[PDB]
Design a protein around this ligand. Structure first.
Ligand SMILES: [Zn+2]
Ligand SMILES: [Zn+2]
Lengths: 297, 269
């Protein structure tokens, strides 16, 4: 699991930073990538990476600002042009449906894959046996959402070499053992499946703020998360400091600041980082193509 | 008057070429720039030029395919973000209004300048005392147009010799069209798509595009003075693009394969 920042700017594109988009790579976990926001030229940034449109499974939009969505039509179109056939779901605030459906309609685009669009509300926006994503209205009167991607604890992996070494060849019995069932082997031995499973893997979690302002809702949303990705500036100081205080109180493990305006160049960026670091040591001022690993434990 | 190619690639963005957009720089003639088509990231390409969003006075869209229009919302947005107050007019086929209006409404974008959207029809789309811009239906499946930008002739100045208006023709996306060559009669510069190589007449037909040879032949029969090939598939970049060029050169000597950031001057003949 890794975060690959495709665009870390704000408002409008700059040679140094494209408008916002962060890729949550889950190749090992689901053979896919999930995108958080999708500003114009996001697919162009991807051309400089190993990420292809076909690998994108989901796209989550935090706010209906142009610098967060104008890259969607193009990305959806390229994925179709390239022959992607897997389903893709877009989650976003009200208006995302119209934006997408109207764009694809006027450009006479016929997708080669199933496309699901969900206009979200505070609560659980997606869940399966592996992950659960919750969305929260961060700022009191704002049509923006923060998201928490929570990887669920993973059942302990099977100690297959030990089984083979006990002369228990791969097959149906492996499934029962995996479930913790007691099994009767071909030679008559009785084996307790649980004795052959490693401890469960604790799920990791990444939180995406969606707005520069902070709140208690943000703090609780990010409680004990591995990485908190926050928008540091408005496209137009204490903001960063507050983000850092929030991460500290929420006990997040790492704070990454993105959505940095042109006003901050070169050293200015490092000063932004320093502001956060003074409160929360493990803080980062993201930059385009930065990649952050999210290890278990 | 110069042509600045911002994006010369076909269908989808490639590291080598971005999707379609050609800037007709008229700084000396009108103190502005006109854009023909606006694919995604056109504004990003502009960041590598001296052209700023506020200097864009008009945008002409050949057809509604994404690689020719997805850059509009961003560009219009940036122009506003940056304080532009001059009117901007966007011309395009039916649906262009819905595309732009929806995009701006869902993002609650309030432009700092007046925006006019003209859903065109074959014929004259714009005319003032200085220019006459005409559109003609081309062959591309979806409703598509080709454009001719005709600078009007002017009397000499206090006397100076008269000035013959220059002309530039844009094919947009299309299969070989007679109406195009007919509209492009005696034009100074013809910008024509060449999505496929000479020997790919079949693929060209199927995807409603043209070949290098077909473009060259159009220029030749229309008596254009210069031909510029654009909308190149990612299958011919680097020196392979030179091969495409040569195919054209063989029919029409004055032919050039465009590439991102290529700037071509349009001299008064
Ligand atoms: Zn095209
Ligand atoms: Zn087309």
């Amino acid at each position: 699991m890794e975060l690959l920042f495709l665009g870390t700017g704000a408002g409008i594109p700059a040679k140094a930073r494209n408008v916002t988009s962060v890729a949550l790579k889950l190749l090992e976990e689901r053979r896919s990538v999930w995108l958080f926001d999708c500003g114009e030229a996001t697919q162009h940034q991807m051309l400089h990476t190993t990420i292809k449109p076909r690998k994108i499974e989901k796209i989550f939009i935090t706010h209906m600002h142009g610098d967060h969505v104008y890259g969607l039509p193009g990305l959806l179109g390229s994925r179709s042009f390239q022959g992607g056939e897997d389903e893709l779901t877009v989650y976003g605030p009200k208006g995302i449906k119209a934006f997408i459906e109207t764009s694809l309609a006027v450009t006479k685009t016929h997708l080669t894959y199933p496309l699901a669009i969900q206009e979200i509300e505070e609560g659980i926006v997606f869940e399966d046996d592996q992950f659960i994503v919750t969305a929260v209205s961060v700022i009191h009167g704002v049509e923006a959402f923060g998201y928490r991607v929570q990887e669920k604890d993973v059942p302990g992996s099977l100690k297959a070499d030990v089984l083979k070494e006990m002369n228990i060849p791969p097959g149906p019995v492996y499934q029962k053992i995996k479930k913790g069932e007691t099994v009767t082997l071909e030679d008559g031995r009785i084996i307790n499946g649980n004795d052959f499973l490693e401890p469960p893997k604790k799920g990791r979690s990444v939180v995406f703020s969606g707005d520069t302002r902070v709140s208690d809702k943000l703090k609780e949303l990010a409680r004990d998360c591995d990485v908190m990705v926050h928008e540091a500036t408005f496209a137009k100081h204490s903001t960063t400091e507050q983000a850092a205080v929030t991460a500290k109180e929420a006990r997040a493990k790492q704070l990454i600041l993105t959505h940095i305006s042109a006003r901050y160049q070169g050293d200015a960026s490092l000063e932004l980082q320093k502001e956060a670091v003074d409160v929360f040591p493990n803080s980062v001022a993201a930059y385009d193509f930065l990649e952050v690993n999210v290890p278990r434990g």
